[PDB]
Short mmCIF file of C-alpha atoms and ligand atoms in Angstrom, two decimals:
data_model
loop_
_atom_site.label_atom_id
_atom_site.label_comp_id
_atom_site.label_asym_id
_atom_site.label_seq_id
_atom_site.Cartn_x
_atom_site.Cartn_y
_atom_site.Cartn_z
CA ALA A 2 118.34 88.88 68.00
CA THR A 3 114.65 89.58 68.59
CA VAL A 4 112.82 92.17 70.75
CA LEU A 5 110.67 91.15 73.74
CA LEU A 6 107.24 89.81 72.72
CA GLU A 7 104.80 92.67 72.21
CA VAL A 8 101.13 92.91 73.11
CA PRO A 9 98.49 92.89 71.80
CA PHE A 10 99.01 90.04 69.34
CA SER A 11 96.26 90.86 66.82
CA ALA A 12 93.31 93.21 66.50
CA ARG A 13 91.30 90.47 64.73
CA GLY A 14 88.26 89.37 66.70
CA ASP A 15 87.33 86.40 64.48
CA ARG A 16 90.19 84.05 65.41
CA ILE A 17 92.38 83.46 68.42
CA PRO A 18 96.15 83.54 67.63
CA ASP A 19 98.04 80.22 68.01
CA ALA A 20 100.49 82.15 70.24
CA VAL A 21 97.87 82.23 73.03
CA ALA A 22 97.82 78.43 73.45
CA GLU A 23 101.64 78.29 73.09
CA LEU A 24 102.13 80.80 75.93
CA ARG A 25 99.49 79.16 78.04
CA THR A 26 101.17 75.76 77.70
CA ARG A 27 104.80 76.88 78.01
CA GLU A 28 104.78 80.08 80.10
CA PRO A 29 101.34 80.99 81.44
CA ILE A 30 102.88 84.06 83.08
CA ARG A 31 105.56 85.71 80.99
CA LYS A 32 107.06 89.10 80.29
CA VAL A 33 105.82 91.23 77.39
CA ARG A 34 106.19 94.81 76.18
CA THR A 35 103.11 97.04 75.90
CA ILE A 36 102.46 99.77 73.36
CA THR A 37 103.86 102.38 75.76
CA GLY A 38 107.23 100.59 75.91
CA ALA A 39 106.64 99.34 79.45
CA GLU A 40 107.17 95.73 80.34
CA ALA A 41 104.37 93.71 81.95
CA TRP A 42 103.48 90.19 82.98
CA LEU A 43 100.97 88.56 80.61
CA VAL A 44 98.85 85.92 82.36
CA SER A 45 97.16 83.41 80.07
CA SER A 46 95.88 80.37 82.02
CA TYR A 47 92.51 80.14 83.70
CA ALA A 48 94.10 79.27 87.08
CA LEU A 49 96.52 82.20 87.07
CA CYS A 50 94.03 84.71 85.60
CA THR A 51 91.57 83.95 88.38
CA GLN A 52 94.31 84.13 90.99
CA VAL A 53 95.22 87.65 89.89
CA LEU A 54 91.63 88.88 89.60
CA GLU A 55 90.77 87.47 93.03
CA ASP A 56 93.70 89.16 94.82
CA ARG A 57 93.10 92.85 95.51
CA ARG A 58 96.83 93.34 96.07
CA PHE A 59 96.82 93.37 92.23
CA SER A 60 95.18 96.77 92.13
CA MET A 61 93.14 98.47 89.43
CA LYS A 62 93.27 101.88 91.19
CA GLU A 63 97.07 101.84 91.36
CA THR A 64 97.47 101.40 87.62
CA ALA A 65 96.77 105.18 87.47
CA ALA A 66 99.73 106.04 89.74
CA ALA A 67 102.22 108.49 88.24
CA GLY A 68 105.35 106.72 87.02
CA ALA A 69 103.78 103.26 86.88
CA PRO A 70 104.42 100.97 83.91
CA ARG A 71 101.37 101.48 81.66
CA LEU A 72 99.37 99.29 79.33
CA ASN A 73 98.11 102.44 77.54
CA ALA A 74 97.57 106.13 78.21
CA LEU A 75 94.75 107.31 80.45
CA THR A 76 91.72 108.60 78.56
CA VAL A 77 90.02 109.71 81.81
CA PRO A 78 91.25 111.66 84.85
CA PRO A 79 93.36 109.34 87.10
CA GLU A 80 90.77 109.31 89.91
CA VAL A 81 88.21 107.90 87.45
CA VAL A 82 90.27 104.70 87.12
CA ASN A 83 88.90 104.06 90.66
CA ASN A 84 85.33 104.85 89.44
CA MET A 85 83.61 101.89 91.11
CA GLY A 86 85.49 102.44 94.35
CA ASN A 87 84.42 106.12 94.28
CA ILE A 88 80.78 105.10 93.67
CA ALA A 89 80.96 102.56 96.53
CA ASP A 90 82.57 105.13 98.89
CA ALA A 91 79.77 107.60 98.07
CA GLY A 92 77.20 104.93 99.14
CA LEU A 93 75.84 104.72 95.58
CA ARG A 94 76.68 101.15 94.53
CA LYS A 95 73.27 99.63 95.32
CA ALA A 96 71.38 102.44 93.60
CA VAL A 97 73.56 102.30 90.49
CA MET A 98 73.12 98.48 90.30
CA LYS A 99 69.40 98.65 90.67
CA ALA A 100 69.16 101.25 87.93
CA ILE A 101 71.06 99.15 85.39
CA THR A 102 69.16 95.84 85.85
CA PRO A 103 67.45 94.49 82.72
CA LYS A 104 64.43 93.51 84.89
CA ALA A 105 63.06 97.14 85.02
CA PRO A 106 59.34 97.29 83.85
CA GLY A 107 59.08 97.61 80.05
CA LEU A 108 62.88 97.53 79.47
CA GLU A 109 63.04 94.10 77.76
CA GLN A 110 60.00 95.12 75.64
CA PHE A 111 61.82 98.37 74.71
CA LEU A 112 64.92 96.30 73.68
CA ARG A 113 62.72 94.00 71.54
CA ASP A 114 60.83 96.89 69.91
CA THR A 115 64.03 98.78 69.19
CA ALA A 116 65.81 95.71 67.75
CA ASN A 117 62.76 94.90 65.60
CA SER A 118 62.47 98.49 64.31
CA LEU A 119 66.20 98.59 63.41
CA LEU A 120 65.91 95.25 61.59
CA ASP A 121 62.72 96.26 59.76
CA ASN A 122 64.55 99.39 58.51
CA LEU A 123 67.43 97.25 57.21
CA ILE A 124 65.02 94.88 55.47
CA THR A 125 63.23 97.84 53.82
CA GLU A 126 66.57 99.33 52.65
CA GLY A 127 67.68 95.96 51.19
CA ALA A 128 70.92 94.01 51.45
CA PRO A 129 73.75 94.59 52.17
CA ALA A 130 73.16 95.85 55.73
CA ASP A 131 75.84 96.87 58.23
CA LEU A 132 75.04 95.02 61.47
CA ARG A 133 77.45 97.10 63.53
CA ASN A 134 76.63 100.65 62.53
CA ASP A 135 72.97 100.07 61.75
CA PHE A 136 72.02 97.42 64.31
CA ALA A 137 74.28 96.52 67.24
CA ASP A 138 75.62 99.97 68.09
CA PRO A 139 72.28 101.87 67.72
CA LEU A 140 70.64 99.10 69.82
CA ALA A 141 73.31 99.59 72.52
CA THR A 142 72.95 103.39 72.33
CA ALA A 143 69.15 103.32 72.55
CA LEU A 144 69.31 100.90 75.47
CA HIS A 145 71.70 103.09 77.42
CA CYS A 146 69.73 106.29 76.82
CA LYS A 147 66.69 104.44 78.18
CA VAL A 148 68.59 103.00 81.16
CA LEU A 149 70.07 106.44 81.93
CA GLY A 150 66.75 108.26 81.51
CA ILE A 151 68.19 110.66 78.92
CA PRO A 152 66.69 111.69 75.56
CA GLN A 153 67.15 109.18 72.74
CA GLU A 154 68.14 112.12 70.46
CA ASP A 155 71.21 112.77 72.68
CA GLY A 156 72.55 109.24 72.19
CA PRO A 157 74.33 109.66 68.81
CA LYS A 158 76.58 112.56 69.91
CA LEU A 159 77.51 110.79 73.19
CA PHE A 160 78.21 107.69 71.11
CA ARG A 161 80.58 109.56 68.83
CA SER A 162 82.98 110.18 71.73
CA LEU A 163 83.58 106.45 71.98
CA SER A 164 85.87 105.77 69.04
CA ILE A 165 88.38 108.00 70.88
CA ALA A 166 87.42 107.46 74.56
CA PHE A 167 88.09 103.73 74.28
CA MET A 168 91.34 104.02 72.36
CA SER A 169 94.29 102.00 73.64
CA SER A 170 97.03 104.54 72.87
CA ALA A 171 100.71 104.79 73.74
CA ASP A 172 100.23 108.53 74.40
CA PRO A 173 97.61 110.91 75.82
CA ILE A 174 94.84 111.79 73.41
CA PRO A 175 93.87 115.48 73.14
CA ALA A 176 90.43 114.70 71.69
CA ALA A 177 89.64 112.41 74.62
CA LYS A 178 89.84 115.35 77.03
CA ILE A 179 87.77 117.62 74.77
CA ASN A 180 85.03 115.00 74.58
CA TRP A 181 85.29 114.02 78.25
CA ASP A 182 84.87 117.58 79.47
CA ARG A 183 81.98 118.21 77.09
CA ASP A 184 80.21 114.96 78.05
CA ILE A 185 80.68 115.72 81.73
CA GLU A 186 79.11 119.16 81.14
CA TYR A 187 76.18 117.43 79.42
CA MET A 188 75.67 115.05 82.39
CA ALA A 189 76.00 117.93 84.88
CA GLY A 190 73.20 119.66 82.91
CA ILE A 191 71.09 116.47 83.05
CA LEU A 192 71.34 116.47 86.86
CA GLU A 193 69.91 120.02 86.85
CA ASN A 194 67.30 119.30 84.15
CA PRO A 195 63.85 119.12 85.77
CA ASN A 196 62.62 116.73 83.05
CA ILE A 197 65.11 113.97 83.97
CA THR A 198 63.23 111.91 86.52
CA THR A 199 63.68 108.30 85.29
CA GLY A 200 66.50 105.81 84.94
CA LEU A 201 69.97 106.09 86.38
CA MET A 202 70.24 109.84 85.89
CA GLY A 203 66.81 110.45 87.37
CA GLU A 204 67.87 108.41 90.44
CA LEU A 205 71.20 110.20 90.78
CA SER A 206 69.37 113.53 90.40
CA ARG A 207 67.14 112.71 93.34
CA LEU A 208 69.90 111.26 95.51
CA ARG A 209 71.92 114.43 94.83
CA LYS A 210 69.24 116.45 96.67
CA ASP A 211 68.81 113.90 99.47
CA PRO A 212 70.52 114.99 102.71
CA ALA A 213 72.19 111.55 103.07
CA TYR A 214 74.24 112.41 99.88
CA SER A 215 74.79 116.15 100.31
CA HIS A 216 78.56 115.85 100.33
CA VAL A 217 78.83 113.53 97.33
CA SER A 218 80.46 115.66 94.65
CA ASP A 219 78.69 116.88 91.57
CA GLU A 220 81.82 115.69 89.74
CA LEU A 221 81.11 112.11 90.77
CA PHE A 222 77.43 112.27 89.86
CA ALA A 223 78.27 113.53 86.33
CA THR A 224 81.10 111.00 86.01
CA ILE A 225 78.76 108.10 86.76
CA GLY A 226 76.59 109.12 83.80
CA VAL A 227 79.48 109.49 81.34
CA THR A 228 81.22 106.31 82.44
CA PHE A 229 78.21 104.04 82.57
CA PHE A 230 76.98 105.28 79.19
CA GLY A 231 80.42 104.80 77.65
CA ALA A 232 81.39 101.49 79.23
CA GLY A 233 77.95 100.02 78.65
CA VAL A 234 77.54 101.19 75.05
CA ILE A 235 81.02 100.25 73.93
CA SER A 236 80.89 96.88 75.66
CA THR A 237 77.41 95.79 74.55
CA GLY A 238 77.72 97.17 71.04
CA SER A 239 81.09 95.53 70.55
CA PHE A 240 80.21 92.22 72.14
CA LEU A 241 76.98 91.89 70.16
CA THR A 242 78.78 92.75 66.92
CA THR A 243 81.50 90.16 67.38
CA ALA A 244 79.05 87.56 68.77
CA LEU A 245 77.04 87.99 65.52
CA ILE A 246 80.20 87.13 63.59
CA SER A 247 80.79 84.07 65.80
CA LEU A 248 77.20 83.00 65.14
CA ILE A 249 77.24 83.70 61.37
CA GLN A 250 80.44 81.56 61.14
CA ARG A 251 78.55 78.71 62.88
CA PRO A 252 75.52 78.10 60.63
CA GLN A 253 74.59 74.83 62.41
CA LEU A 254 74.39 76.73 65.76
CA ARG A 255 72.61 79.68 64.06
CA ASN A 256 69.99 77.22 62.71
CA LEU A 257 69.62 75.53 66.10
CA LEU A 258 69.04 78.85 67.90
CA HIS A 259 66.60 79.94 65.19
CA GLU A 260 64.66 76.65 65.65
CA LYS A 261 64.88 76.61 69.46
CA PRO A 262 65.11 80.23 70.74
CA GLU A 263 64.85 78.93 74.34
CA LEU A 264 68.54 77.91 73.84
CA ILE A 265 69.54 81.56 73.20
CA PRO A 266 70.63 82.27 76.81
CA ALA A 267 72.94 79.19 76.83
CA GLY A 268 74.14 80.24 73.35
CA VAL A 269 74.92 83.79 74.57
CA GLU A 270 76.85 82.39 77.52
CA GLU A 271 79.08 80.42 75.13
CA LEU A 272 79.36 83.44 72.80
CA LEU A 273 80.54 85.39 75.84
CA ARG A 274 83.05 82.68 76.71
CA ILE A 275 84.62 82.64 73.23
CA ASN A 276 84.42 86.39 72.76
CA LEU A 277 87.52 88.30 71.68
CA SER A 278 86.02 91.74 72.29
CA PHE A 279 88.58 92.86 74.90
CA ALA A 280 91.64 93.85 72.89
CA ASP A 281 94.09 93.95 75.81
CA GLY A 282 94.56 92.06 79.04
CA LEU A 283 92.88 93.55 82.11
CA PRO A 284 95.56 95.62 83.84
CA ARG A 285 96.53 95.49 87.51
CA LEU A 286 99.48 96.94 89.42
CA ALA A 287 101.11 94.79 92.11
CA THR A 288 101.06 96.45 95.55
CA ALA A 289 103.22 93.71 97.12
CA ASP A 290 105.61 90.95 95.98
CA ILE A 291 103.29 88.10 94.98
CA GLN A 292 104.03 84.64 93.59
CA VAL A 293 102.02 83.88 90.42
CA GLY A 294 102.96 80.50 89.03
CA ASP A 295 106.72 80.39 88.44
CA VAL A 296 107.08 84.22 88.72
CA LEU A 297 107.51 86.39 91.77
CA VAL A 298 105.73 89.56 90.62
CA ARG A 299 107.33 92.56 92.31
CA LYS A 300 105.58 95.52 93.90
CA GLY A 301 105.00 98.20 91.25
CA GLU A 302 104.89 95.82 88.27
CA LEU A 303 102.08 95.65 85.74
CA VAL A 304 100.11 92.46 85.23
CA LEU A 305 97.80 91.85 82.27
CA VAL A 306 95.05 89.28 82.63
CA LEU A 307 94.33 87.86 79.19
CA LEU A 308 90.65 86.97 79.12
CA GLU A 309 90.87 84.71 76.09
CA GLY A 310 93.81 83.02 77.74
CA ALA A 311 91.48 81.93 80.54
CA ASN A 312 88.38 81.42 78.39
CA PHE A 313 90.07 79.19 75.83
CA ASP A 314 92.04 77.21 78.44
CA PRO A 315 91.35 73.49 77.66
CA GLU A 316 92.09 72.56 81.26
CA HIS A 317 88.97 74.52 82.29
CA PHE A 318 86.84 74.41 79.08
CA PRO A 319 87.53 71.19 77.15
CA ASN A 320 87.35 71.67 73.31
CA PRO A 321 87.54 75.42 74.03
CA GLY A 322 87.04 76.67 70.50
CA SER A 323 83.64 74.91 70.23
CA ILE A 324 80.33 76.38 71.38
CA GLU A 325 78.75 73.63 73.47
CA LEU A 326 75.43 74.46 75.09
CA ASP A 327 75.65 71.70 77.71
CA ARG A 328 78.87 72.51 79.53
CA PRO A 329 78.87 71.81 83.31
CA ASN A 330 80.55 75.19 84.10
CA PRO A 331 78.91 77.60 81.59
CA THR A 332 79.02 80.83 83.55
CA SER A 333 82.53 80.26 84.94
CA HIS A 334 84.13 82.19 82.06
CA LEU A 335 85.85 85.53 82.66
CA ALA A 336 84.03 87.60 80.02
CA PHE A 337 82.72 89.92 82.79
CA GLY A 338 85.87 89.65 84.89
CA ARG A 339 86.05 88.23 88.41
CA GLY A 340 86.46 89.52 91.93
CA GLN A 341 86.32 93.09 93.15
CA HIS A 342 85.90 94.59 89.67
CA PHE A 343 83.34 92.11 88.28
CA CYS A 344 81.21 93.88 85.66
CA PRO A 345 78.26 95.73 87.29
CA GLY A 346 76.35 95.60 83.97
CA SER A 347 76.64 91.83 83.39
CA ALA A 348 72.91 91.12 83.48
CA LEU A 349 72.13 94.02 81.18
CA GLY A 350 74.89 92.98 78.76
CA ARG A 351 73.57 89.41 78.65
CA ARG A 352 70.00 90.64 78.01
CA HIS A 353 71.03 93.08 75.29
CA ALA A 354 72.78 90.26 73.38
CA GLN A 355 70.03 87.72 73.96
CA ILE A 356 67.31 90.05 72.68
CA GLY A 357 69.41 91.33 69.80
CA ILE A 358 70.16 87.78 68.63
CA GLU A 359 66.57 86.59 69.16
CA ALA A 360 65.25 89.47 67.04
CA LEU A 361 67.88 89.02 64.32
CA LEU A 362 67.25 85.28 63.95
CA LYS A 363 63.49 85.80 63.75
CA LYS A 364 63.74 88.68 61.17
CA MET A 365 66.78 87.43 59.18
CA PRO A 366 66.96 83.64 59.54
CA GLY A 367 69.12 83.54 56.40
CA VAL A 368 71.68 86.06 57.77
CA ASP A 369 75.18 85.64 56.35
CA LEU A 370 78.26 87.71 55.71
CA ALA A 371 78.02 89.64 52.42
CA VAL A 372 81.81 89.82 52.09
CA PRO A 373 84.53 87.16 52.67
CA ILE A 374 85.37 87.21 56.38
CA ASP A 375 88.91 88.35 55.78
CA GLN A 376 87.53 91.58 54.29
CA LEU A 377 86.32 92.82 57.68
CA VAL A 378 88.42 95.79 58.82
CA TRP A 379 89.49 95.36 62.43
CA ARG A 380 89.86 98.53 64.48
CA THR A 381 93.42 98.94 65.81
CA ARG A 382 94.83 100.47 68.99
CA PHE A 383 91.45 100.25 70.62
CA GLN A 384 90.27 98.71 73.93
CA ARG A 385 87.86 96.50 71.96
CA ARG A 386 88.24 94.37 68.87
CA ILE A 387 85.52 95.25 66.37
CA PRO A 388 85.02 95.33 62.64
CA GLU A 389 84.50 98.86 61.31
CA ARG A 390 81.53 97.62 59.25
CA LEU A 391 79.73 94.24 59.39
CA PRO A 392 78.17 93.78 55.92
CA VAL A 393 75.50 91.08 55.78
CA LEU A 394 72.86 89.75 53.48
CA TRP A 395 69.84 87.50 54.26
C1 HEM B 1 78.58 92.20 77.01
C2 HEM B 1 78.77 93.28 77.69
C3 HEM B 1 79.86 93.57 78.63
C4 HEM B 1 81.10 92.97 78.77
C5 HEM B 1 81.68 91.81 78.02
C6 HEM B 1 81.73 93.67 79.84
C7 HEM B 1 82.96 93.25 80.43
C8 HEM B 1 83.55 93.81 81.53
C9 HEM B 1 84.77 93.33 82.15
C10 HEM B 1 85.62 92.19 81.66
C11 HEM B 1 84.98 94.10 83.25
C12 HEM B 1 86.08 93.96 84.28
C13 HEM B 1 87.25 94.88 84.07
C14 HEM B 1 88.39 94.65 85.01
O1 HEM B 1 88.29 93.90 85.96
O2 HEM B 1 89.49 95.30 84.77
C15 HEM B 1 83.92 95.11 83.26
C16 HEM B 1 83.85 96.16 84.16
C17 HEM B 1 82.90 97.18 84.08
N1 HEM B 1 81.83 97.24 83.25
FE1 HEM B 1 81.27 95.80 81.97
N2 HEM B 1 80.94 94.70 80.32
C18 HEM B 1 79.80 94.64 79.60
C19 HEM B 1 78.69 95.45 79.81
C20 HEM B 1 78.62 96.50 80.69
C21 HEM B 1 77.48 97.35 80.88
C22 HEM B 1 76.16 97.22 80.20
C23 HEM B 1 77.87 98.36 81.73
C24 HEM B 1 77.06 99.50 82.27
C25 HEM B 1 75.87 99.91 81.87
C26 HEM B 1 79.20 98.04 82.16
C27 HEM B 1 79.96 98.76 83.04
C28 HEM B 1 81.19 98.41 83.54
C29 HEM B 1 81.92 99.17 84.54
C30 HEM B 1 81.54 100.52 85.05
C31 HEM B 1 82.97 98.37 84.94
C32 HEM B 1 84.06 98.71 85.96
C33 HEM B 1 83.83 97.92 87.27
C34 HEM B 1 84.85 98.03 88.44
O3 HEM B 1 85.91 98.66 88.12
O4 HEM B 1 84.55 97.53 89.49
N3 HEM B 1 79.65 96.87 81.52
N4 HEM B 1 83.03 94.90 82.24
O1 1G4 B 2 84.28 102.58 85.40
C1 1G4 B 2 85.36 102.74 84.93
N1 1G4 B 2 86.31 101.99 85.47
C2 1G4 B 2 87.76 101.97 85.02
C3 1G4 B 2 88.01 100.50 84.40
C4 1G4 B 2 89.27 100.40 83.59
C5 1G4 B 2 90.49 100.45 84.18
C6 1G4 B 2 91.74 100.33 83.42
C7 1G4 B 2 91.64 100.14 82.05
O2 1G4 B 2 92.87 100.03 81.44
C8 1G4 B 2 90.44 100.08 81.37
C9 1G4 B 2 89.27 100.20 82.17
C10 1G4 B 2 88.01 103.15 83.91
N2 1G4 B 2 87.04 104.23 83.79
C11 1G4 B 2 85.63 103.71 83.80
C12 1G4 B 2 85.26 103.11 82.36
C13 1G4 B 2 85.29 104.21 81.32
C14 1G4 B 2 86.51 104.57 80.64
C15 1G4 B 2 86.60 105.58 79.74
C16 1G4 B 2 85.42 106.35 79.41
O3 1G4 B 2 85.51 107.35 78.56
C17 1G4 B 2 84.16 105.99 80.01
C18 1G4 B 2 84.09 104.88 80.96
#
C-alpha cells in the first residue's frame, strides 16, 4: 500500500521531475494531497490549466474561506487573499498599474545603473560571487523601493520579512504576523510622511486625500504597499536568480545573448516559459460543480494549476525543455498566470530580468557556476523555488 501522491514534488528549480510529464500524459487532472493534509486536484496540461484560470467559478478569493481544503496556511489576513479585487473595488487598479510600469522616466536607467554598480562591486571583491544575495535580490529590492517611492535604505528590512512571508507552510506562522503588522505600520507611516511624493506610495498618498477616495480604508492603502513590495521583490528576485541558472546551464544560449543582446527579450520570454520559480500550483476553490477533463470537480474542492505542467506541455510548446527564440507562440506561456488574476507586474518583471541579464552578460561574459550544480541548496516549504546562494565565477 502507498499513500496518495503528495505535492509539491521537488523544491529543485534546476530540473523538472519526470512525474510531471507522466501525470500530464496519463491523468492531466488527478487527486493529490497537500502539505496541510487536504486533498486537491492537480492540473498539469496546458489545455486544462488555461480552462481553470479562465473560469472565475474557480475562485482565488474563496481559497481563504474558513474550513476550505488548503494548499498552505495563510500568511496574510484572509481579506488580503482578495487583494486585487479590493484594489479594483476601491477604484485604484488603473493608478496602481500605471505606477508599476517599467516605462516611467529614468526607471530603466536606474535599473541599469543599479545592476552595473552591483556587478562592479562583485568584480572588485573577486570570485566567487553570490548572484542571489549580492545581485538578483538587491536589484529587485532597489527596483521596488524606487517604484514605491520609498527610501532605498528601508529596502533591506522590508526584504527580510520575505523568507517567512512567502513560506508555504502546513500551519500558521507566528513570525509572519509579527512582520506583517510591522510592515503595515511602516507603510501607514509612509502615507503620512510628507517626503513621500513619488512612485506608487506617493500616488496612493495623494489619492488618499482626494475626495473621490475618502472612504477607501487606510488599511487598504497600507496593504497595497506591503503586498506590491513583497510580491514584486520575491517574484523578480527569484525569477532572475533561477533564470540565471537556466542561462549558465546553456552556454551556447549565453554566448548568443552576449553576442546579440537584441535577442535578450526573446530569451527572457523563453526563460519565463521554462521557469520553475513557483513552487506550488496556483490555488483555486471551486464555487460550482465543473467538468475539467475526465473529472467533475465539486463545489468546495481545491484545484492546483501547475504552471510547469502547462509550460512544458509538448502539445503546446514542442521540444518544451529547449529554449527556442523563434517559437510562433512565445508569450502564450503561463508564467504570469492567465485570466482575472494575471500578474499586474508582468511588464516590470520582464524588464527587471532583461536589464539584469543584459548587464551581467556585458560585465561577466565568462559567468559560470563556481560549484557543481547539485551543490545548490534549494529552499523548502516556500512559495518559490530558489537556491539559498548562487556561487559563480567569471
Ligand atoms: C518575473 C516576475 C514575476 C512573476 C513570474 C510573477 C508571476 C505571477 C503569477 C503567476 C501570478 C498569478 C497568480 C494566480 O493567478 O494565482 C501573479 C500575480 C500577482 N503578481 Fe506577479 N509575478 C512577477 C512579478 C510581479 C511584480 C513585479 C509585481 C508587483 C510589483 C507582482 C505582483 C503581483 C500581484 C499583486 C499579483 C496578484 C494578482 C491578482 O490576484 O489579480 N508580480 N504574478
Ligand atoms: O496580492 C496578493 N494576492 C494574493 C495572491 C495569492 C493567493 C493565494 C496564494 O496561495 C498565493 C498568492 C495573496 N496576497 C497578495 C500577495 C502577497 C502575499 C503575502 C505577502 O506577505 C505579500 C504579498
